[PDB]
Amino acid sequence: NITKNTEDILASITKEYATQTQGIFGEMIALNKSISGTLTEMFRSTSKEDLDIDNITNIITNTFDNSAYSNFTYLYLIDPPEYFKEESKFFNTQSGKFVMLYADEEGIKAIQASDEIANLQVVQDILKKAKYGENKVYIGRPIKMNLEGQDFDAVNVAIPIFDRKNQVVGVIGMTLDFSDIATYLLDPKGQKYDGELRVLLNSDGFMAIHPNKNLVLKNLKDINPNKGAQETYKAISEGKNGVFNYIASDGDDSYAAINSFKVQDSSWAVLVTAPKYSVFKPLKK
Ligand SMILES: [Cl-]
DSSP states (O other): OHHHHHHHHHHHHHHHHHHHHHHHHHHHHHHHHHHHHHHHHHHHHSOGGGOOHHHHHHHHHHHSOSOOSOSEEEEEESSOOHHHHHHOGGGBOTTOOEEEEEEEOOOEEEEOOOHHHHTOHHHHHHHHHOOTTOOOOEEOOOEEEOSSSSOEEEEEEEEEEEOTTSOEEEEEEEEEETHHHHHHHTOGGGOOSTTOOEEEEETTSBEEEOSSGGGTTSBHHHHOOOGGGHHHHHHHHTTOOEEEEEEOTTSOEEEEEEEEEEETTEEEEEEEEEEHHHHHSOOOO
16 A cells, blocks of 8 residues: 555656756757757858857847746857957956856846856866767756856856857856755645755765755765665666665665756656655655
C-alpha cells in the first residue's frame, strides 16, 4: 500500500517537474538558435565596414522582448568595429571587451557589461572548439553570477556567431536565474511530505536548486557520501529514471525518485524525496 503508492507518487512528481524544466530550457534554446541564425547570416553577408550596430541591437531586443525565462541576454563580439565600443559605456567591460548585455526592464534594457560574461566557461569553450557547420548549443553547469550587484545562481546557454570566413566572431547567449525555477520547484503549496526535498542537479551531481540554499552549486556526492545514497547517484550519473531507498544529506532515511532528462548535450535530473517516517506517520498540518 503506502510504500508502493509513495514510490509511484514520487515518480509522478519528479516527471512533472522534469517536464516543466525541460520545456523552459527548450524555449530558451529555440530563441537562442533563432538569434544566432540571424546574426550569423548578417556577419556572413555584411562586410565589417558595413556592420550596423542598430541592426544588431534590434535583432536582440526584438528576440528577447517577449517575457522570456532568460533573465539576461548577451552578445560578445571578439573584434567588432571600433565605433561599436564608442556607442555606449555599457557595451565595454573593464578590460575593453565588447559585450552587449541586456536585463529585463519590467521588455529588455542594456545594462553595464562585465568580463564575467566573456570569461564564462561556455564562452571559452565556444572560442576554443566551435566550428562552422556544427549545430551545437553550449550549456554550462550551475554557477554563481553577479551582474547587477547581487549574487545569483545561474546556468548559461550560448551559441557561436560566424563570419563568411567560417570563423567564430562572437557568442550570443542567455542566462537563466535558478530562482525562477525554484518558484515552482520549491513552492510550499507543492510540499506533499514532511521533510520532502526537491532538487534540480546536473548528471555530474552539481546542484542548481536545493531547499538548503547552502548546498546550491555543491556536488551532492561530496556532501552526502554515505553508502545508502550511492544507488541514487548511479542513476543520476547514468541519466536514468527510478525510485530508490535513499539516505539524505540531513540523515533522513527516505524514498527518492529520479527523473533524468537531456537538454542538447547537457544532462539533468530532478530528485524528490519522502522521508520514510513522514510517509508512514504523516503529521496533520
Ligand atoms: Cl558557463
